[PDB]
Amino acid sequence: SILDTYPQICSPNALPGTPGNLTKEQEEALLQFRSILLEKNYKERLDDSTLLRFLRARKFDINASVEMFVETERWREEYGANTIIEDYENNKEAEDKERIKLAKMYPQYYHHVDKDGRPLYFEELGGINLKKMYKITTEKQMLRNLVKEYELFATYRVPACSRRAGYLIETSCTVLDLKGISLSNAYHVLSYIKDVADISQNYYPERMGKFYIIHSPFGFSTMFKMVKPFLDPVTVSKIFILGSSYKKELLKQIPIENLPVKYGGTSVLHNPNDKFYYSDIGPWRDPRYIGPEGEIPNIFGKFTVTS
Ligand SMILES: CCCCCCCC/C=C\CCCCCCCC(=O)O[C@H](COC(=O)CCCCCCCCCCCCCCCCC)COP(=O)(O)O[C@@H]1[C@H](O)[C@H](O)[C@@H](O)[C@H](O)[C@H]1O
C-alpha cells in the first residue's frame, strides 16, 4: 500500500508508545487491539501508526481505544471525511475561489518544517473582522475547511515529510499569531473553538506536536482557561502561550532558515512580491519526496505560491 512507500518507524528520540519505540506490553496491546478491530470487520486504517495514535490517546486502555476508533470510523463516514479530498477535486474551482476570498483576512499556511521535520503551520488572526468574514463563509464551512486540511496533512504532508526526515512524522508544529486581535473577540469565538476541539480531540488523536500562541492580548491566558475544559491535559501540555521573547523561544524548535522574518527567522519567498497567505512551501512540493499519492492539490488555485 501507500504506507509501504514511506517510513513507518518514528525517530528513536521520540516519546514512548510511538511506532518503533514500544515497550513489550505496548506491543502486545497493539496486537490485541488490531485483532479485536479485525474481528469486528474493520479493514482500513489498521496500520501501526494509526492504531498507536488511538492507543496513546487512551493510555493503552484497549477497550477505551476500541470505542474511540469505532466512533471515529462512524464519524468519518457520516461527515464524509473519507471522500472530502475527492469531493473537493470535483468542485475545485468554486472552492478555490472561496479560500482566495478569505486568505488575506485569515492567513492559514504551511511553511517548511520544524527541527524534527514536522510540517510547520501558521495562522494569523489579527486581520479577521467577524462581520465581514461571515459574509463570505459560515462557521460550519470553516470547520469543514479545517477537516479537509487534516486530511491533506495525512495524505500528502505526512508521507513527504517522513521520506525527507527518514522516519515517520505524524504531527505538526503550529504557530497562532494573535497580533491585532482584541480580548473581546477571543471570548466571542469560544463556540467555534469548542467545535474545533471536539472534532480534533475525538477524531484526530495524537496529531498535535507543538502549538505556540504568540502576540496574544493581555488577559489571554485567562480567556484560555475557558478553552481547557474542551481539551485533554495532554493537549494542554503541548500548548505554549509566549510573551516578548517568543522569537528566541521559537528558534529552539524551528530552524532560523525556515522561520519567516517577521517571526524571528530569515525565511523569504522566491518572489518578494508574493504573499505568505497564498503560499504552501514544503517537502510535499519536492519531486524527490512525493510518492504514489501524487502531489497535493493547490488550495489557492492559480494564486498558489509554491516557492
Ligand atoms: C472564526 C475565527 C476563529 C479564530 C480562531 C481559530 C482557532 C483554531 C484555529 C486553527 C485550528 C488549529 C488546529 C490545530 C490542530 C493540531 C493537531 C490536532 O488536531 O491535535 C488534536 C487536538 O486539536 C485540538 O484540540 C484543536 C484545538 C487546539 C487549541 C486551539 C486554541 C485556540 C485559541 C484561540 C484563541 C482566541 C482567538 C480569537 C481570534 C479572534 C479573531 C477575530 C489532538 O490533540 P493531541 O494532544 O495530539 O491528542 C489528544 C487526543 O485527541 C485526546 O483524545 C486524548 O485524550 C489526549 O490525551 C491526546 O492524545
Whole-angstrom distance, CA of residue 161 vs CA of residue 166: 8
175 closest CA partner among 282, 251, 286: 251
Whole-angstrom distance, CA of residue 164 vs CA of residue 120: 14
Compute CA 201 distance to the chain's CA centroid, rounded to the nearest angstrom: 12
Candidate of 136, 183, 196 to mutate for ligand 1, largest count of ligand atoms within 8 Å of Cβ: 196
Under 8 Å between Cβ of 297 and 88: yes
Whose alpha carbon is nearest atom 46 of ligand 1? 235
Whole-angstrom distance, CA of residue 194 vs CA of residue 196: 5
Q: How many CB atoms lie within 10 A of CB 262?
A: 12
How many angstroms does the Cα of residue 194 sit away from the middle of ligand 1? 9
Whose alpha carbon is nearest atom 48 of ligand 1? 206
Resolution of this PDB entry, in A?
1.9
How distant, in Å, are the alpha carbons of 68, 184, 268, 283, 307 from that of 271? 46, 37, 8, 19, 8
Half-sphere exposure at residue 2, Cβ-oriented, CA atoms within 13 angstroms = 14
- Coil, strand or helix: which one is 101? helix
How many angstroms does the Cα of residue 292 sit away from the middle of ligand 1? 30
Whole-angstrom distance, CA of residue 102 vs CA of residue 97: 9
What domains appear along the chain, each with residue ranges and CATH number? Answer: 1-79 (1.10.8.20), 80-307 (3.40.525.10)
Cell triple for residue 46?
Answer: 489498521
Whole-angstrom distance, CA of residue 94 vs CA of residue 158: 27
